[PDB]
Design an enzyme around this catalytic site. Structure first.
Site, PDB file in Angstrom:
ATOM      1  CB  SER A  42      84.471 124.503  86.932  1.00  0.00           C
ATOM      2  OG  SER A  42      84.397 125.734  87.096  1.00  0.00           O
ATOM      3  CE  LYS A  45      86.592 124.931  90.535  1.00  0.00           C
ATOM      4  NZ  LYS A  45      85.606 126.216  90.580  1.00  0.00           N
ATOM      5  CB  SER A 103      81.801 126.531  90.286  1.00  0.00           C
ATOM      6  OG  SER A 103      82.815 126.339  89.345  1.00  0.00           O
TER       7      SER A 103
END
Ligand SMILES: [Br-]
Length: 263
Positions: A42, A45, A103
């Site tokens: 993640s 991102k 997230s």
């Protein structure tokens, strides 16, 4: 010295650790396996949000534009997208905030669809000078963290350098930079990772990642009491530790970096 200390942590924990501490201008200060390849998870991102802010900067995107979706677009972990879905959309702003602070995988995937998909995020990295980072899958299959797979990967130095340019360099406008920084400071997922190793007087923003095969990652920026500006990337694979121990592991790396950071 710094590299032996990380090596010692690798030993006690039966873990692989990649770390890069970089200056405001992107110079590597200390590192360890800083050029080895790890799954982004993640952490991707953060650059994705930066690409969307860059499109906003250019007038190619509107922060209030409605990104329409339905039930089928949801993901197993998509807590904001689940809440908004009956309304039929999230705005660009809401998707950025959810993707960064929670997230949310569906929020991220709405943003990827809008920037033209994993290949355009890879191109954005290349356009910043990052020669390594690449996205290939959408969330969450990009979390597979398979050995020798180069899909969805970065290196500690690449990511830390990329993030120093976004946070401290001239890629984004002053407005976008300030928004990205404040969004990352209010990250809800990182209280036990890098921040837990840094003094509470320092301003800190971060984006975490948890993957398969023991993958746990964090990249943070911080500003010291003296006004000195840094990015720390920590990428770990620790399949034998329990989740809380993986966060302790990252925090321990951050403590070592804290020590080294000086006037
Ligand atoms: Br993800």
């Amino acid at each position: 010295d710094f590299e032996h200390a990380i090596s010692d942590l690798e030993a006690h924990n039966q873990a692989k650790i990649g770390v890069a501490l970089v200056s405001e201008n992107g110079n590597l200060i200390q590192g360890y396996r800083a050029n080895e390849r790890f799954a982004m998870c993640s952490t991707f991102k953060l650059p994705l949000a930066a690409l969307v802010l860059s499109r906003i900067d250019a007038g190619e995107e509107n922060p209030e534009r409605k990104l329409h979706y339905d039930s089928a677009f949801l993901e197993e972990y998509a807590p904001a997208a689940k809440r908004y879905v009956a309304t039929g959309y999230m705005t660009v702003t809401e998707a950025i905030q959810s993707a960064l602070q929670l997230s949310d995988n569906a929020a991220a995937n709405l943003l990827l669809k809008e920037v033209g998909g994993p290949p355009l995020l890879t191109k954005y990295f290349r356009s910043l000078g990052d020669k390594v980072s690449r996205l290939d899958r959408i969330a969450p299959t990009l979390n597979t963290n398979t050995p020798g797979d180069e899909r969805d990967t970065t290196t500690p130095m690449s990511m830390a350098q990329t993030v120093s340019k976004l946070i401290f360099g001239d890629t984004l406008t002053y407005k976008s930079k300030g928004q990205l920084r404040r969004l990352l400071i209010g990250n809800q997922t990182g209280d036990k990772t890098i921040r837990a190793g840094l003094p509470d007087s320092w301003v800190t923003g971060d984006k975490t990642g948890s993957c398969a095969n023991g993958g746990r990652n964090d990249v943070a920026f911080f500003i010291t009491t003296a006004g000195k500006k840094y990015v720390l990337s920590v990428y770990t694979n620790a399949p034998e530790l329990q989740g809380e121990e993986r966060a302790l592991l990252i925090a321990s790396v951050a403590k070592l970096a804290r020590q080294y950071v000086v006037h």
